Design a binder for this molecule. Structure first.
Ligand code: HEM
Lengths: 500, 499, 499, 499
């Protein structure tokens, strides 16, 4: 008897008490007489095409892999439910918040960012925290990170930013030169960078980290009244991080540390919890705000905008088949039921398209048919048909054009989006200098203390030292802008490494 | 009011008595407030990405199409069942023939060959007749034509043959030069060609034609006793053909004539029936045979090898969704359950690979998950895992390696194939001159009569006339070899057009 | 002898003078000893996997097909060039209009709409006229129709519209009930419908018809000044249309009529020509305009906005390989270089996404790498990388992020788009009643005459008759709205067939 | 300053002396005015679809990934050439061995086995060593490992094996239970296992390990004379392995150790070298052979079958774009030009299908079009056409069927394969007990010494200990068979960890 995660097979066999083994068939259901030997003419003769038992299995085996997530490749999954503990209907009408005590099945997948499919879990990198709500009014995907902000505030830079974080095109190796060249050119990433290289940079598992929606969403109540908000879910298991020494060791001792940890916790009745809160901001305050409420590189102070309890997030069920329930799960930020809408956030606007579009590539056009993704707690009925690998009945033989005089599904005028009044030219408004220091300075100071500030600079210089000097300079100048000590301290550390 | 096929929508609505209209939702299940208008900034402003309702619908619509079958593109489908009427267990042990009265669900798809997705039904071209059996011991796919023979007897020429029958690479139009060049170079196709251009060349619907497995298959009884055979299923609706004049008209009047014809039949309780027969040849007669018993360009005479009743084939249900139940159904000749095996037939040997292979591209690696294809009458339990669009539970968390000491599915020693002894060199044995006239002559003479003979020659000349002269010559030479009158009669008609 | 199209193979062979035949290799380049026979153990033995020559060919053959266009499936292509004859640089700064006498290689593909890959050419249906300009400032695609307007003015209905125009979900047969139920619910379709069922409904070939960009575009000169416009290209061969009878016959006699006709013309130095014109409208008139200048269901009168000659369109080259140069060619209405931009036109706004989106599914994510589609007359240099089937050098080992301090490509501030001021709410503005009879009436009256009016109603009634009475009424109510005579005349004809 | 590998971007910038930066364009070649800001209505307004610049870049970025190799995912690549140093023409007629001094361009990709794309290099696992020769007679792919043998000898077990080597279906974590349960059930794996857990198990880079073809191949000379053989390429840099402690540290310090190490070597004119040898066995000795000459779990003793020098392998060129030149390169063992053929080896037989098949899925049906894969030193001319992403001219408008009378490519009777006479029943001959200890016992003793023995038993026990007891027992049992001391020693170590 070892950890539950190790006795998977042992427990699976223990479930089959007196039941005899199933009959080994092919793909079509035909039984196999011998699957341990290939057909040949003579004991030492060639293999003939006749062996359809071989090909069948082989062929499929040849198609086991699928393209990995362009980002957030390495991750882990689990299931549970979401419970409403407080009434916040005066803000949103969403069926998911209907009444207290209302439980809604959910799905969650944690992950890293730049790391590829075989990468290690315990490494400095933001964390992925996506939640899928199977509500009556359709599925609701809340794709969030473990940090309330981000490096850039314009989607048009994302493809590049990520490129910089990955491997070099020619060498296929991590390139500090790329990582900092971009960062040193986009001083807006300062905030997030400070947060990334801090202690929260390497959480001690998926259960010891918080979660935020990150972007600014919009909420609408049964009276068409709208208000902005931010989603936050605090770990009831406490915030815990691994030291640079431990993460590095575990990095190779157990690359799937995060995976194992989560699985064993659940398998042993140690179901992980998270508390759901929302920060509210009326339209009025939205203006008075000293910054761009929709600037992903900014946060909403808890003093002027306190968190409001909403419910609880609980994970009490591991997946049965990783590939089918995790690797295949897809979250779409556009999946928002009535009561929840988007906002003028550029990064959010650009995300409304990237995901569904990429899913049609990674999984397929009809990826919403795969169980995990299928909105079973709803009733899909529209005018879409066909597509490769079309499961179900393709909606049978119902009219496939709207409108029509034959009782086919109709639109519901109560599901209408909220309307806002905008005005101005239609152009590319430069947001490069939307103040990339203030909020950062307040963080380096008040938020952190001596120890942290020291460790932080250390963490940074340890990495930034491996870049060219001309890049090192730019970065420091940006850091100095945040605070004179923030810059110098790093400079001092670099001089040491640069020395020898 | 009108034919049931025309009142589809009307009947669908009629089925919804008091029921109210379902709520229109996006793909994720989210309800729509208005699907008749896109979101814009101002009544005359641009469109914004925010409208996911629009993109959701559009995006999917942009991915409705899938690659059509490389062959037998235009077809029709229907469902029914197979019923055993006579006991033939002394030949095969297949669970499908188990006991008399045993009914097994089946699927059928009729089709043409060269014609693309938008082609017309009533056209001179072989007909496709595939039957999928959902038996306990797995799915059984009997893919067959409406003709007992074929043009070539070697798979390595199929790709070319089909090419010659399709459009020209540069112009994209049917090229008579291509069609006859290949045929004039492969006299073995004479048999099938003679069949093709005869009256049966254009059946009057899919219900008035017979079906054959064509290939020589092997049967294995409960005692490891093997014997060869050939499947035949006769139309209980009689054999009817359309005249050149009629087929031409219908070719444009109603291109989907076949589809509509079948659909209304079933819809009107006029369920089509087919009688199942099998020709048995023992291993002994297998040698005595004057030809190659596995030669696809040769038939088994009903005199020496009479048909043996097996059962009935009935189609009593139209598909609910064409794309889902028909355009997506896949048939694999490899799908043969215990009791039925393949044979040394080259053309079939090459067919054992091509289908499953082509299916993984047309539909996908896990196409066997698509309902119509999934062998629901059996229990799939192996060590295959993953693959794009993986439905089901991927077999859950069960051992994924054989062997193993954890109770995973095991092989069944009783499903072992039948063993045969072979011997000789492993090379490319030329089968180009395996006699391409003997049976063909006996066809042109005894099988047909004055009228048919005349019409046939006419049908041929009418087509071959559009090809180059030097090609015409070669073809005539090959016909003359079948029968002196066969050729000359053609040559005569040709001179007229050519003149 | 015969037409150049029929003697394809012949001329190809004639091109190989004393040149000996190339050596037949496999896929990887290895020579083939015999491709006419498969490998087996003994003459009558089974086939073995060893024969990779067989599999290599067979497999590929099993993957020849690819999803056909979701719309405008059946088409024909040709190549030529565009030449500027008049100076309009005072309107647009586009490099393609740079100076008079400037020639720019082009690509063109004609098509139908609902008809699948196998359908016939000579059929009542709007025609597709796309043009690809291989300019220095990138490729510019001018995806147009043979009609200046369309059935609907909102993209969110298109999916549905094309659905109704196609096959029934269950029967898979054209369904008049759908076709008219939709049209009868969207009176905005009247205009185009009236045009479609007119004599221009079935052009005699692709060379005897006009083309228009249909949508309203925006033009910007070297001084940031922008004006709206509409593209029209008239056939220098004249407007010719086949009669109902003729088209019907040809619909089956030669389903590739349009393909054959165009190929031969080019083949015999009868290079088809079209003249390029443009309708200009300043921002001022854009307001005064009694209608919505961006309403695809409207037209700009020639009296108020005359056509202005710009250049000539010449097709002087047939494709060498249909599949490679035509079936694979992709047009993106989004591909507009500096000097030409989009407009508030909802229909056009939605198209900006639909095309590139579907191309990545039909052909692949790197379809811009396919020769015909690649913008060879320009230098592609960005930060995009990887992707399935990545041809070229994936841009070598260059910085793949922007910005950077390493010399990678930089943005050109001279290629900025034109900025326009907007304002208002962001919602779905209902544009279902933007007047659907005023211009339509002006067409039925002044545009046509006695004959055409008679023929039109005839054409319509002949079709709308096969629909359900309750549906028949609706349509008529709509036609009566356009003109009392328009509706009644149809009504009269209907009562006849309904009898 | 730093290693060449780190100063990539720097050196690329250096190459661009006085040249200005290229113009940043979209996919279609259209220039971009600002790629640092998305278009929105007002500074804080929503984003609109008009931003094709955004969508273009975005959409593509969304399709950057492609399925990774099912096996050997984490690897490195490089280019160089092969040079014949010795004459062996008396054995094979392959154009690559033509004459001494003949240089042929080659491609190489080294790799691990179970580890995924992001895994670490310095890990205990066999090493991938594939070579692609761009010969005149087509491409020749010699796909080999760093070990001369393998765990299993029948391909039908491969899928399972690899399954056991990877992650658990439920937990997704390596499962020592799976790894050993299979291994303990297939005693034939012993040989390879012993090698894997020896010091050669974790090579210090790709340049310090040897390469073998592993399988038994057949050679044919100009006079149809055939002999069997084995391929071996020793490293001219000597064999060097990292310690368990060292590999463990590098395993996290630099997971791309192997990639980096190789790149730099080449970048600093330290071009790695490998010598090519072959082991010949006539048909006669093939029989007298105490074992099955085609048993992949056996090796050919250098005393009875000495290495024969053939040439030199050199790698003098790094890739420019990893994705394009390395991640996309595909090696097909089937690719073997005249002179080199396969053998009855079951493991090889099954590989003749697996690769070309898996490639058609991972890259595409026309993957042989991607440069690195295209056989540029040969002329591809066959009868294959179409296929998704069809680059080139699809062979233009040439006859697409065989045979034909128009000068299309023709087969070369001199490229016919070598024929062998086989005899016996066609069934699944069990090969589970083909002696799994003899050659292993010889390895454990004479091959290794005290140190190695101890270190091997150590390395094994270190891993085998994390498996269930019952599994531990079976393993030891198998080990004991090899040699009493082999098993006991392991039993000893085990007892300690177990207690
Ligand atoms: C908003 C409505 C429309 C939508 C969403 C739409 C969508 C499409 C799509 C998805 C394709 C398939 C592209 C491919 O796979 O190659 C297509 C092709 C085509 N469409 Fe439309 N279309 C619309 C309106 C029109 C109109 C009004 C015209 C003419 C101005 C037109 C002319 C064509 C032509 C010529 C093609 C063939 C281009 C090619 O082969 O790539 N379409 N359309």
């Amino acid at each position: 008897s070892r950890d539950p995660a190790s006795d998977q097979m042992q427990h699976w066999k223990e479930q089959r008490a007196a039941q005899k083994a199933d009959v080994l068939t092919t793909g079509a259901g035909n039984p196999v007489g011998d699957k341990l030997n290939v057909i040949t003419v003579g004991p030492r003769g060639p293999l003939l095409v006749q062996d359809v038992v071989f090909t069948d299995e082989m062929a499929h085996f040849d198609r086991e892999r699928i393209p990995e997530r362009v980002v957030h490749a390495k991750g882990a999954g689990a299931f549970g439910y979401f419970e409403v503990t407080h009434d916040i209907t005066k803000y949103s009408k969403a069926k998911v918040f209907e009444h207290i005590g209302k439980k809604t099945p959910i799905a969650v997948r944690f992950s890293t960012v730049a790391g590829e499919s075989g990468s290690a879990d315990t490494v400095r990198d933001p964390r992925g925290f996506a939640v899928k709500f199977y509500t009556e009014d359709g599925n609701w995907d809340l794709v969030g990170n473990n940090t309330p902000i981000f490096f850039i505030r314009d989607p048009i830079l994302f493809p590049s930013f990520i490129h910089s974080q990955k491997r070099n095109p020619q060498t296929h190796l991590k390139d500090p030169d790329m990582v900092w060249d971009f960062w040193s050119l986009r001083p807006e990433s300062l905030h997030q960078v400070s947060f990334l290289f801090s202690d929260r940079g390497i959480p001690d598992g998926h259960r010891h980290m918080n979660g935020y929606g990150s972007h600014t969403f919009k909420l609408v109540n049964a009276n068409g009244e709208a208000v902005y908000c931010k989603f936050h879910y605090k770990t009831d298991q406490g915030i815990k991080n691994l030291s640079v020494e431990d993460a590095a060791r575990l990095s190779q001792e157990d690359p799937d540390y995060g995976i194992r940890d989560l699985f064993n916790a659940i398998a042993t009745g140690k179901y992980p919890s998270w508390t759901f809160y929302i920060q509210v901001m009326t339209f009025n305050q939205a203006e008075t705000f000293p910054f761009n409420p929709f600037d992903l590189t900014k946060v909403w102070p808890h003093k002027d905008y306190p968190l409001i309890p909403v419910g609880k997030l609980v994970l009490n069920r591991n997946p049965v088949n990783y590939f089918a329930e995790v690797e295949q799960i897809a979250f779409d930020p556009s999946n928002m039921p009535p009561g929840i809408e988007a906002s003028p956030d550029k990064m959010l606007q650009g995300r409304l398209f990237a995901y569904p579009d990429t899913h049609r590539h990674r999984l397929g056009p009809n990826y919403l048919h795969i169980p995990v993704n299928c909105p079973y707690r709803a009733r899909v009925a529209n005018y879409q048909r066909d597509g490769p690998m079309c499961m179900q009945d393709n909606q049978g033989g119902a009219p496939n054009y709207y409108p029509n005089s034959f009782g086919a599904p109709e639109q519901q005028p109560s599901a209408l989006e909220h309307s806002i009044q905008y005005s101005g030219e239609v152009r590319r408004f430069n947001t490069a200098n939307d103040d990339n220091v203030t909020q950062v300075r307040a963080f380096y100071v008040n938020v952190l203390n001596e120890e942290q500030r020291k460790r932080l600079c250390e963490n940074i210089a340890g990495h930034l030292k491996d870049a060219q000097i001309f890049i090192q300079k730019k970065a420091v100048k940006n850091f100095t802008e945040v605070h004179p000590d923030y810059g110098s301290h790093i400079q001092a550390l670099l001089d040491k490494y640069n020395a020898e």
